[PDB]
């Protein structure tokens, strides 16, 4: 199917908003926004570029990878972008 959703997620400090555009099992587009800190700041663009377009199955692979390049996201754990980005 073609599917598009929007999701909020309260972390310990902050709120991750996600919008995903899904073509079957595959990520056509993604936009991540909201109330948080992330250094470097343009790492947010890397995280969107990485997810576009992988498979909604191998999301965690992408999250954990991303973080292992050394990204600092105060009060927002890596399993917070998992809850934010998860549909089912």
């Amino acid at each position: 199917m073609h599917m598009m959703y929007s999701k909020n997620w309260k972390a310990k400090k902050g709120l991750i908003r996600v919008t995903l555009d899904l073509d079957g099992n595959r990520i056509k587009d993604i936009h991540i926004s909201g109330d948080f800190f992330m250094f470097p700041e343009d790492s947010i663009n890397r995280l969107e570029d990485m997810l576009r377009g992988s498979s909604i199955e191998k999301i965690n692979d992408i999250i954990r990878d991303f973080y292992n390049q050394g990204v600092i996201t105060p009060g927002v754990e890596p399993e917070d972008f998992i809850q934010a980005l998860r549909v089912i």
Partner: protein, 255 residues
């Protein structure tokens, strides 16, 4: 005690230009320069965090009706309402590490040391606010930024703000639950003038004193340099003055 510059530099009728100055001063700071403390106020406006998209966070039509300016800042967080009753300040220092949690914690301690001068029992602050016990109301919110060589911290303190406005600007999932958040806000935030009778200039003077002592800096008033001036105008002309920037869509360096 090393020398610092106190910049009393503000454009309340232009929040966008105000935020440009904040980025300029951060951006032109070479490691080893005198640390900077700036104080400033914004007239009616909503400032959204860097990762925020205006249309998702705030009621744009309510803002336009009432002449409330939209503005996006360089740092994360956090959308907030500002008026002439908020004292805004920022601190830029040399940095040799990337421990942003330490910065937040240090600056919170300086705020607390400052409000003690006014006879207030202020309290951190898991990371980026300061409160007065009553059971506690937030009176200050903060954000910041780091890069190789420099850190930026800035905060807004509610001195005599219209606390009702904090909720009137936010975008509500259903307009019926506009009341659950409004009554929750008023129970969680206060003005410094709720607890002590201070003018905004005495709050500021306490802050200058608290920050001097806690940071071991002797802040003497200074003016903006030409280098900081140009960069500010450029940042305004190319970035802060644009709808794309303020709407939350521009996420790339344009210098």
């Amino acid at each position: 005690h090393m020398e610092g510059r106190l910049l009393l530099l503000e454009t309340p009728g232009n929040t966008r230009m105000s935020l440009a100055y904040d980025e300029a001063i951060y951006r032109s700071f070479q490691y080893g320069d005198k640390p900077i403390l700036r104080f400033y106020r914004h007239d009616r406006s909503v400032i959204i965090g860097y990762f925020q998209v205006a249309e998702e966070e705030v009621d744009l039509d309510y803002m336009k009706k009432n002449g409330i300016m939209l503005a996006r800042r360089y740092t994360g967080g956090g959308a907030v309402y500002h008026d002439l009753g908020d004292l805004n300040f920022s601190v830029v220092r040399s940095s040799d590490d990337m421990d942003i949690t330490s910065m937040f914690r240090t600056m919170n301690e300086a705020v607390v040391n400052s409000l003690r001068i006014l006879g207030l029992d202020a309290r951190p602050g898991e990371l980026n606010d300061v409160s007065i016990p009553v059971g506690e109301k937030k009176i200050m919110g903060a954000a910041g930024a780091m890069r190789k060589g420099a850190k930026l911290w800035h905060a807004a303190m509610l001195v005599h703000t219209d606390l009702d406005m904090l909720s009137a600007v936010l975008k509500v999932p259903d307009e019926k639950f506009r009341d659950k958040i409004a009554k929750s806000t008023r129970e969680r935030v206060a003005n410094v003038t709720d607890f002590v009778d201070v003018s905004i200039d005495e709050v500021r003077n306490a802050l200058i004193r608290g920050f001097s002592e806690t940071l071991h800096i002797d802040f003497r008033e200074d003016t903006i340099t030409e280098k900081e001036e140009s960069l500010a105008r450029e940042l305004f002309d190319k970035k802060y003055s644009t709808e794309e920037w303020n709407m939350g869509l521009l996420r790339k360096e344009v210098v």
